[PDB]
Amino acid sequence: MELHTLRYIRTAMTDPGPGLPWYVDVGYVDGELFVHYNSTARRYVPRTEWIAAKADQQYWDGQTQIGQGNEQIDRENLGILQRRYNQTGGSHTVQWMYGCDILEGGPIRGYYQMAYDGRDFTAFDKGTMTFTAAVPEAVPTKRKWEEGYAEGLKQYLEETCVEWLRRYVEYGKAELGRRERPEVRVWGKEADGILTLSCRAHGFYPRPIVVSWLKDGAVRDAHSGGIVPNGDGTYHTWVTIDAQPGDGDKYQCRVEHASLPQPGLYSWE
Amino acid sequence: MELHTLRYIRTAMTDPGPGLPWYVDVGYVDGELFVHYNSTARRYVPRTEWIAAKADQQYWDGQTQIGQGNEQIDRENLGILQRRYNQTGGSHTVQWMYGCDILEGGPIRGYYQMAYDGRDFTAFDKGTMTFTAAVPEAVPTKRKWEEGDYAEGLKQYLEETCVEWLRRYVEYGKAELGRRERPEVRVWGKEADGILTLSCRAHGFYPRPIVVSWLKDGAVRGQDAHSGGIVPNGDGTYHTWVTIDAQPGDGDKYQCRVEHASLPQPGLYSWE
Amino acid sequence: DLTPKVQVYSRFPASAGTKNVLNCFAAGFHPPKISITLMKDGVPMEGAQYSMSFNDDWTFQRLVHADFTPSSGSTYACKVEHETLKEPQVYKWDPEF
Amino acid sequence: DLTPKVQVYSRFPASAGTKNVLNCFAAGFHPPKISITLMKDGVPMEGAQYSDMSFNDDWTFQRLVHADFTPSSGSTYACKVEHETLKEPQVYKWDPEF
Amino acid sequence: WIIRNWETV
Amino acid sequence: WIIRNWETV
Numbered sequence: 001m002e003l004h005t006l007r008y009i010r011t012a013m014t015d016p017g018p019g020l021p022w023y024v025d026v027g028y029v030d031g032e033l034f035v036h037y038n039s040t041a042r043r044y045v046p047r048t049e050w051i052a053a054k055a056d057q058q059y060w061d062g063q064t065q066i067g068q069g070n071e072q073i074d075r076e077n078l079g080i081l082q083r084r085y086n087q088t089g090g091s092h093t094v095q096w097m098y099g100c101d102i103l104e105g106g107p108i109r110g111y112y113q114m115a116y117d118g119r120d121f122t123a124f125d126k127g128t129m130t131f132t133a134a135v136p137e138a139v140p141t142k143r144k145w146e147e148g149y150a151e152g153l154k155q156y157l158e159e160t161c162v163e164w165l166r167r168y169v170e171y172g173k174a175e176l177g178r179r180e181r182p183e184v185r186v187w188g189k190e191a192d193g194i195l196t197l198s199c200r201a202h203g204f205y206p207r208p209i210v211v212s213w214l215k216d217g218a219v220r221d222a223h224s225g226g227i228v229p230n231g232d233g234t235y236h237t238w239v240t241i242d243a244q245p246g247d248g249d250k251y252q253c254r255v256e257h258a259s260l261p262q263p264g265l266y267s268w269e
Numbered sequence: 270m271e272l273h274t275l276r277y278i279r280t281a282m283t284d285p286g287p288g289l290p291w292y293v294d295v296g297y298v299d300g301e302l303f304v305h306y307n308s309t310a311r312r313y314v315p316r317t318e319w320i321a322a323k324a325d326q327q328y329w330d331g332q333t334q335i336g337q338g339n340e341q342i343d344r345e346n347l348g349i350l351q352r353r354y355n356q357t358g359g360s361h362t363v364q365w366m367y368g369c370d371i372l373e374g375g376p377i378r379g380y381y382q383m384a385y386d387g388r389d390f391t392a393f394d395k396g397t398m399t400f401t402a403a404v405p406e407a408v409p410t411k412r413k414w415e416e417g418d419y420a421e422g423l424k425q426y427l428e429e430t431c432v433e434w435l436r437r438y439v440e441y442g443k444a445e446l447g448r449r450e451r452p453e454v455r456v457w458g459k460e461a462d463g464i465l466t467l468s469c470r471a472h473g474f475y476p477r478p479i480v481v482s483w484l485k486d487g488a489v490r491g492q493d494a495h496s497g498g499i500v501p502n503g504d505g506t507y508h509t510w511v512t513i514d515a516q517p518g519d520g521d522k523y524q525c526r527v528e529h530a531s532l533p534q535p536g537l538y539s540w541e
Numbered sequence: 542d543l544t545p546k547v548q549v550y551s552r553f554p555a556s557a558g559t560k561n562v563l564n565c566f567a568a569g570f571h572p573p574k575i576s577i578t579l580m581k582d583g584v585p586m587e588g589a590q591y592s593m594s595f596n597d598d599w600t601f602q603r604l605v606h607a608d609f610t611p612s613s614g615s616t617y618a619c620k621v622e623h624e625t626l627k628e629p630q631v632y633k634w635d636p637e638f
Numbered sequence: 639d640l641t642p643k644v645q646v647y648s649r650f651p652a653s654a655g656t657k658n659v660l661n662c663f664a665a666g667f668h669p670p671k672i673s674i675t676l677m678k679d680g681v682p683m684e685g686a687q688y689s690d691m692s693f694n695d696d697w698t699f700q701r702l703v704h705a706d707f708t709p710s711s712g713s714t715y716a717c718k719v720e721h722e723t724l725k726e727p728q729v730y731k732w733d734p735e736f
Numbered sequence: 737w738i739i740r741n742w743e744t745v
Numbered sequence: 746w747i748i749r750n751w752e753t754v
Binding site: 011036093097236 | 640650668687690691692693722
Binding site: 008025027044063066067069070073074076077080081098112141144145148149152153156160161164 | 737738739740741742743744745
């Protein structure tokens with residue numbers, strides 16, 4: 001079954017760090033970064049080859065204008081929320097995430113969620129067409145918005161978001177569905193009478209992977225770094241197991257991945 | 270048989286909380302807090318009336334001075350361990366617990382144990398007169414303390430000094446340590462989601478051990494029950510609560526039974 | 542590394558208008574830094590007192606107590622913040638009257 | 639506030655003298671301001687690129703830094719991280735695994 | 737395609 | 746009566 005996702009995330013900061021934009025908005029299709037806007041560049045730009053090739057000029061200019069308009073509203077929001085919380089200076093951050101999921105071409109999720117200072121602020125409930133106030137300072141926002149706007153947002157999440165996701169999926173189909181096999185190394189180092197065995201998988205796509213240590217052929221005291229990105233749109237993971245010196249040969253790393261018809265099996269040599 | 274315990278615990282923290290001391294040392298006799306030192310007050314002080322009453326002035330001044338010396342060494346201990354583990358700042362804590370137990374006046378335990386970041390680091394084994402390195406980073410401590418022959422003095426402290434003072438403290442606090450305070454018990458009930466939860470709470474008992482049991486039709490019912498253990502009131506008395514889940518309308522089948530040193534017979538209580 | 546296990550209780554079985562003490566006890570936690578605050582109708586109570594120990598397993602415990610007279614019209618609670626928790630947790634007192 | 643959880647790793651399994659990319663990844667932190675610096679023998683590595691910042695469904699932020707490098711067998715590589723939740727820079731060492 | 741912001745918080 | 750500390754760890 002064919003599952004695809006469109007997710008936009010946005011941040012407004014009083015304190016991005018030296019030489020960094022206070023305002024950043026990026027989009028992802030199936031977890032792949034494909035567009036980016038920020039307050040320094042003041043333009044939407046491609047982050048994949050496929051969006052770069054297949055979107056027209058009106059796409060880039062249209063969204064740039066929306067992006068510039070949003071920035072101004074978002075600058076104000078941060079200002080408002082600080083004044084509202086009676087705060088002078090310091091470090092404050094507004095965050096938003098929204099988008100839609102399709103399954104066999106049909107919509108299954110539509111969402112819109114906001115945070116202030118790392119915690120939930122509001123979320124849109126598409127069924128009831130209301131906003132939830134997860135904090136008291138979200139009450140004036142819930143009111144201001146519900147006495148339109150909610151009909152507009154519902155339409156965006158069920159119609160606009162879904163038709164564009166279908167379009168993106170068609171534009172990027174080859175790239176989004178690609179596979180790249182992991183390059184795996186087993187590394188052992190002995191210290192304090194413990195043999196630590198490492199299985200490290202490099203350069204896999206897509207993101208999900210399962211890497212297990214087997215002792216005498218049974219799944220095992222492991223520790224995992226989880227899945228972390230490389231710079232090039234592939235992923236990385238490592239898993240360790242503690243063993244007794246001399247028992248190296250009873251251990252075998254198993255890697256299960258969409259790129260591999262049969263699990264990879266790797267040993268310490 | 271008369272059992273008594275002396276336990277000192279010590280904590281050194283990089284991050285104790287705003288306005289709180291980074292170094293705290295406290296002692297307990299038979300479970301009861303009796304002395305306190307911290308890096309803010311910089312003085313050992315009484316925490317029971319009996320030690321305030323019966324200890325001379327050299328007790329406080331003598332230990333105040335050792336406390337200040339100990340504080341300097343334990344400040345360095347925290348730094349050394351961070352550097353040994355190659356940590357740079359952040360939240361780390363060192364803990365020590367040591368002391369002795371007597372039974373009819375004779376020693377039955379003498380121990381000294383240290384932890385780093387909430388896990389075993391070293392302990393004294395008085396039998397072999399060695400230190401056990403629980404983790405690899407303890408090995409340099411073991412070697413150094415064995416090289417210095419500090420085990421000799423430590424064994425003297427645990428077997429002679431600690432025990433001698435415990436005997437004095439139990440004489441000092443005999444009245445207080447030996448007292449009995451009866452619990453005030455309340456049974457309460459609340460129904461929600463088709464479950465009746467009955468609660469039995471015992472407030473203000475001393476000494477600390479107690480058995481609070483739910484009976485159903487006269488029999489102990491221990492699986493269905495949930496105890497919150499024995500928790501302090503901080504005036505030297507204790508509290509406990511036990512609940513049991515019943516079916517609505519079945520309250521009259523249940524009785525709470527309270528067994529305590531202050532009560533010649535168990536207390537029985539119903540949900541009224 | 543380990544979350545606080547928290548209980549809220551009064552020194553004496555309560556009645557409305559009888560002076561008492563409200564207790565909040567947290568145990569089993571690490572690191573030792575913790576925030577424990579007694580609340581009345583969603584506002585911190587006056588005159589709280591902070592205990593400060595650890596057990597044989599090395600985990601910390603802390604008692605907070607404050608004198609109070611429980612009223613029928615109010616609710617009381619204990620709010621706990623610890624590095625092991627995402628959000629402050631609020632434990633309600635049952636007055637049992 | 640949440641402290642960065644940091645990992646250092648190379649794009650490919652490393653060999654002395656083969657071109658590669660050194661990565662330093664920080665996740666699970668708030669606020670978003672953070673400094674992440676790749677170093678060789680205590681000297682910042684030239685050519686580092688910072689990925690667009692992202693945040694996860696729990697709102698916590700992540701950032702990847704990467705730089706092209708050819709690993710030297712006789713050098714140590716690390717990532718130095720500064721964040722508000724820690725008073726001192728944190729240094730995380732790369733294990734070449736060769 | 738991104739949301740056009742409607743009004744402030 | 747408390748311990749007088751010996752050397753650091």
